Amino acid sequence: AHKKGLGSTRNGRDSQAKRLGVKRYEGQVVRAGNILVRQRGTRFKPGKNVGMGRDFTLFALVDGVVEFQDRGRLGRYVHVRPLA
Amino acid sequence: SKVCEISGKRPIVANSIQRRGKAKREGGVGKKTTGISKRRQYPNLQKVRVRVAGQEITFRVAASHIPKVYELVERAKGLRLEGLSPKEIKKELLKLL
Amino acid sequence: ASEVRIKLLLECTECKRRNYATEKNKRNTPNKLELRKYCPWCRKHTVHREVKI
Amino acid sequence: MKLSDLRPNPGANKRRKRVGRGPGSGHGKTATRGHKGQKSRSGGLKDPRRFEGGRSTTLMRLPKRGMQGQVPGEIKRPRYQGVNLKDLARFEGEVTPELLVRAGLLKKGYRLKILGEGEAKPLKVVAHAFSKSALEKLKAAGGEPVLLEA
Amino acid sequence: PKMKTHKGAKKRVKITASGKVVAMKTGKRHLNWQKSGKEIRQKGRKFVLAKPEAERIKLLLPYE
RNA sequence: AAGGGGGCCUGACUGCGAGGCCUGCAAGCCGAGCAGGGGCGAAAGCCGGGCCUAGUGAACCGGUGGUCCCGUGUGGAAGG
RNA sequence: ACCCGGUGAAAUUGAACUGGCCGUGAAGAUGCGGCCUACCCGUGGCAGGACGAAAAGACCCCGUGGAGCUUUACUGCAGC
RNA sequence: UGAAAAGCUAACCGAGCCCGGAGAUAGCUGGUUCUCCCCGAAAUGACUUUAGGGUCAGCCUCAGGCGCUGACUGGGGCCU
RNA sequence: CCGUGGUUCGUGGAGCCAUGGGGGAAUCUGGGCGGACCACCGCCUAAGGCUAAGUACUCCGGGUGACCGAUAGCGCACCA
RNA sequence: GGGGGGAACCUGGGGAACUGAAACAUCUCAGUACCCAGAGGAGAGGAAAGAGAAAUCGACUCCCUGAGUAGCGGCGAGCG
Numbered sequence: 001a002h003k004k005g006l007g008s009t010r011n012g013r014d015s016q017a018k019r020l021g022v023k024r025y026e027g028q029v030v031r032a033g034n035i036l037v038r039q040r041g042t043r044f045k046p047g048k049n050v051g052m053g054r055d056f057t058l059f060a061l062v063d064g065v066v067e068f069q070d071r072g073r074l075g076r077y078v079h080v081r082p083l084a
Numbered sequence: 085s086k087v088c089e090i091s092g093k094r095p096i097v098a099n100s101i102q103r104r105g106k107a108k109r110e111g112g113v114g115k116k117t118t119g120i121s122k123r124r125q126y127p128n129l130q131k132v133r134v135r136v137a138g139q140e141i142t143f144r145v146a147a148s149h150i151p152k153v154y155e156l157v158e159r160a161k162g163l164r165l166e167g168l169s170p171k172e173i174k175k176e177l178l179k180l181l
Numbered sequence: 182a183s184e185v186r187i188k189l190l191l192e193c194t195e196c197k198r199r200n201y202a203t204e205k206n207k208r209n210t211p212n213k214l215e216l217r218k219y220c221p222w223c224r225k226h227t228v229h230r231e232v233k234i
Numbered sequence: 235m236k237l238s239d240l241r242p243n244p245g246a247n248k249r250r251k252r253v254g255r256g257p258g259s260g261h262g263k264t265a266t267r268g269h270k271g272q273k274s275r276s277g278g279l280k281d282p283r284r285f286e287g288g289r290s291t292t293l294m295r296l297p298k299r300g301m302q303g304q305v306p307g308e309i310k311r312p313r314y315q316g317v318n319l320k321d322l323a324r325f326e327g328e329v330t331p332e333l334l335v336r337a338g339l340l341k342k343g344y345r346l347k348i349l350g351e352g353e354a355k356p357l358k359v360v361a362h363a364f365s366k367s368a369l370e371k372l373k374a375a376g377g378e379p380v381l382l383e384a
Numbered sequence: 385p386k387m388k389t390h391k392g393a394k395k396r397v398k399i400t401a402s403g404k405v406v407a408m409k410t411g412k413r414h415l416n417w418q419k420s421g422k423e424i425r426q427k428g429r430k431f432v433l434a435k436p437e438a439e440r441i442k443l444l445l446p447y448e
Numbered sequence: 449a450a451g452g453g454g455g456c457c458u459g460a461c462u463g464c465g466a467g468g469c470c471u472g473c474a475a476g477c478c479g480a481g482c483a484g485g486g487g488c489g490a491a492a493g494c495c496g497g498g499c500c501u502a503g504u505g506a507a508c509c510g511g512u513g514g515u516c517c518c519g520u521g522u523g524g525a526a527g528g
Numbered sequence: 529a530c531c532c533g534g535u536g537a538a539a540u541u542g543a544a545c546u547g548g549c550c551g552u553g554a555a556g557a558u559g560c561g562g563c564c565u566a567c568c569c570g571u572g573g574c575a576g577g578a579c580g581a582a583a584a585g586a587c588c589c590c591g592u593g594g595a596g597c598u599u600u601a602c603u604g605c606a607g608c
Numbered sequence: 609u610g611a612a613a614a615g616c617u618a619a620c621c622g623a624g625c626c627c628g629g630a631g632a633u634a635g636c637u638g639g640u641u642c643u644c645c646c647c648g649a650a651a652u653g654a655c656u657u658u659a660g661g662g663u664c665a666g667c668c669u670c671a672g673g674c675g676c677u678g679a680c681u682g683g684g685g686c687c688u
Numbered sequence: 689c690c691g692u693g694g695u696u697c698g699u700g701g702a703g704c705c706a707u708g709g710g711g712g713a714a715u716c717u718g719g720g721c722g723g724a725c726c727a728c729c730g731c732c733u734a735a736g737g738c739u740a741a742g743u744a745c746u747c748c749g750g751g752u753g754a755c756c757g758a759u760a761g762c763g764c765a766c767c768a
Numbered sequence: 769g770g771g772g773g774g775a776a777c778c779u780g781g782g783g784a785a786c787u788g789a790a791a792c793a794u795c796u797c798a799g800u801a802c803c804c805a806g807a808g809g810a811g812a813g814g815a816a817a818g819a820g821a822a823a824u825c826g827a828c829u830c831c832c833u834g835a836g837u838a839g840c841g842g843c844g845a846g847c848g
């Protein structure tokens with residue numbers, strides 16, 4: 001009756017979502033070790049008191065307060081000012 | 085095969101277990117049973133004719149006890165038996181048992 | 182891995198323990214693998230060599 | 235007090251729940267079971283402490299560990315029960331395991347190991363075993379530790 | 385009749401003093417040649433089961 | 449410089465792991481720092497594989513090398 | 529078959545005070561809306577509707593349902 | 609048993625009838641009975657021989673604890 | 689020794705008790721057993737049989753019910 | 769001297785499947801239902817070739833406990 005010669009689909013897939021992005025913002029208080037940015041490549045660069053992991057993850061090296069900075073052509077940086 | 089007239093041996097139920105695969109003993113994964121089923125195991129019943137009091141007697145026994153049949157003849161030699169029917173005699177021999 | 186990129190253990194020549202496991206290409210680098218490596222048993226470093234996985 | 239005077243305290247005796255007795259009760263029709271599905275049926279669900287709808291269960295995906303024993307079963311070893319000095323206050327003079335058991339402390343068929351928690355009184359405690367710290371702590375407060383081998 | 389201990393749980397898991405439920409980390413039985421040292425090491429430890437699944441397992445070990 | 453060449457090398461470490469990302473579970477991911485014994489560097493330092501994101505498979509059952517913990521009256525052995 | 533005397537069942541039936549049209553509404557309304565129509569009760573007739581009766585659709589799909597049959601599906605048993 | 613239709617074997621035979629295992633099993637359908645008061649959902653995610661069924665989470669409710677932390681709004685950084 | 693049963697034991701390191709098949713002793717300086725096997729240290733005396741009580745049940749007799757009260761209680765209060 | 773009957777209980781010879789495993793074959797159901805032989809107010813068992821770790825116990829049976837332990841187990845369901 002109805003269901004005639006239809007077709008198929010040579011594609012139709014995707015990968016899992018990877019939850020990338022900034023994870024702590026300017027002014028947020030953070031413990032040393034806190035993840036600050038998940039990223040691909042240096043969309044952000046590590047600054048004061050901030051280290052970078054093998055997959056470009058940015059984390060705090062000290063307890064402190066997160067601070068952002070756009071230095072134009074030198075890129076964007078995440079810092080952590082320690083607290084007295 | 086029914087019952088051995090000497091030993092009372094008779095057929096019993098026994099399983100046929102079917103296995104598969106390498107033994108753990110030989111560093112295999114281990115045996116796997118693919119089936120269990122019942123069969124029977126019969127006594128090795130055999131026929132032993134024999135002549136007691138000149139009359140010919142015939143026993144049906146496991147092979148295991150055949151020599152015991154010949155022991156009985158040896159022992160019934162010290163016995164009044166004549167003019168007895170073959171059944172009469174056999175019943176008497178088994179009484180020696 | 183593959184028939185050609187194979188797995189293997191590194192065995193300490195001093196005390197014969199295998200302390201590391203890795204790989205190699207058999208075609209490319211066909212010789213046994215010689216390498217210094219820390220031995221937890223000997224508690225020093227040691228020349229370890231390849232050993233069939 | 236009369237037989238009529240007798241009654242329980244409030245709360246001591248609640249009326250049991252009775253589902254399926256009509257609209258006003260609050261448990262009618264479905265009888266708190268909702269609509270349809272395995273769980274609503276008499277008999278109901280597979281044991282929910284384990285079953286997960288047929289996926290490999292969380293319990294069965296964890297790995298087994300340590301000696302699991304094997305036939306012909308377990309090996310009888312001497313069992314040791316600990317007791318601390320802190321629970322030796324209610325004693326004077328000798329302190330045998332025989333006392334310690336006749337006291338609700340030392341569980342029967344257990345050998346006596348003195349542990350070091352709490353402070354010590356100078357007494358003759360007789361045990362099958364002593365904590366490193368307990369031994370010396372008792373010796374410091376002057377007491378007399380004797381080791382049984384029976 | 386009286387409840388039976390689930391021997392599968394009894395062989396995989398422990399109830400700590402406070403009723404925590406611990407097990408070995410999964411994922412170390414094999415395929416390790418290319419697993420990092422860190423990973424093989426961290427999986428060497430025990431871990432506390434999440435509360436929901438933990439409390440299901442405790443019910444299984446009732447005479448524990 | 450994450451790219452191209454060279455020198456020396458094996459950290460493609462062992463024992464850990466504050467703190468977080470992710471997340472129903474179980475998984476997955478990043479990680480400073482401490483100790484051991486090393487590499488390269490005058491040094492500060494960097495090194496617990498690879499510019500990063502795929503290259504994978506829980507548990508059960510068994511194999512192989514260690515260890516020498518249990519081992520049914522005791523010592524071995526079998527087996528764990 | 530119809531009428532009179534005699535005897536006298538049945539499937540079915542929520543209750544019924546049970547009209548038409550055009551709309552409407554779970555999309556095919558005696559039962560909702562707006563109109564139209566219709567004094568009360570029967571008898572002999574016709575079958576358009578009451579998605580009329582009957583049979584918890586046989587088709588279709590679903591169920592980690594059942595059964596019969598097939599084989600170089602798996603495993604087993606008889607037999608040889 | 610069948611001059612073959614899976615025919616027949618006590619009025620329905622692709623496996624007779626009776627009693628028994630037996631309250632087989634039914635993730636399905638149906639049914640589940642007095643009253644008033646307070647609160648009040650969900651029809652989503654993940655895995656699932658799973659897809660009209662489940663396990664964990666989400667949302668409801670009750671008790672105990674905490675005590676201004678809440679939705680929403682004003683000011684201000686940062687992220688897109 | 690081979691094939692099996694029993695036991696918590698599903699071939700397992702698989703003893704012990706039982707035995708359908710094959711081989712096949714000894715009479716105490718002998719045999720079996722204490723979970724492969726061996727040594728040691730021990731337990732027991734196979735291949736003949738009998739034996740009360742304590743236990744099980746309720747056709748039958750009695751006694752008693754926060755047991756039923758003629759759609760209940762046995763199928764049957766009655767000519768079941 | 770036997771034969772045959774007896775509500776259930778008892779020993780022995782033979783012995784299922786539905787079901788559970790959310791499929792299924794090992795496993796489970798269960799040595800259950802059932803068939804057969806026999807015993808008797810009981811029947812079975814019973815005076816160690818025992819237990820099993822103590823230099824111990826001392827026929828058997830029955831109850832509580834040991835214990836859902838030790839173990840068994842597609843090491844699953846479960847069994848014990």
Ligand SMILES: [Mg+2]
Pocket residue numbers: 001002003
């Ligand atoms: Mg069509």
Ligand SMILES: [Mg+2]
Pocket residue numbers: 004005006
């Ligand atoms: Mg087509």
Ligand SMILES: [Mg+2]
Pocket residue numbers: none
């Ligand atoms: Mg094409």
Ligand SMILES: [Mg+2]
Pocket residue numbers: 014015016017
């Ligand atoms: Mg994507």
Ligand SMILES: [Mg+2]
Pocket residue numbers: 016017
């Ligand atoms: Mg994800």
Ligand SMILES: [Mg+2]
Pocket residue numbers: 014015017
């Ligand atoms: Mg997507």
Ligand SMILES: [Mg+2]
Pocket residue numbers: 052053054
């Ligand atoms: Mg770096």
Ligand SMILES: [Mg+2]
Pocket residue numbers: 037038039040055056057058
């Ligand atoms: Mg990153």
Ligand SMILES: [Mg+2]
Pocket residue numbers: 026068069
């Ligand atoms: Mg700023």
Ligand SMILES: [Mg+2]
Pocket residue numbers: 070071072
């Ligand atoms: Mg600037």
Ligand SMILES: [Mg+2]
Pocket residue numbers: 072073074075
């Ligand atoms: Mg620039």
Ligand SMILES: [Mg+2]
Pocket residue numbers: 073074075
């Ligand atoms: Mg720059």
Ligand SMILES: [Mg+2]
Pocket residue numbers: 073074075
């Ligand atoms: Mg730049």
Ligand SMILES: [Mg+2]
Pocket residue numbers: 073
């Ligand atoms: Mg630039």
Ligand SMILES: [Mg+2]
Pocket residue numbers: 085086087088144
């Ligand atoms: Mg015969």
Ligand SMILES: [Mg+2]
Pocket residue numbers: 095096097
């Ligand atoms: Mg038999």
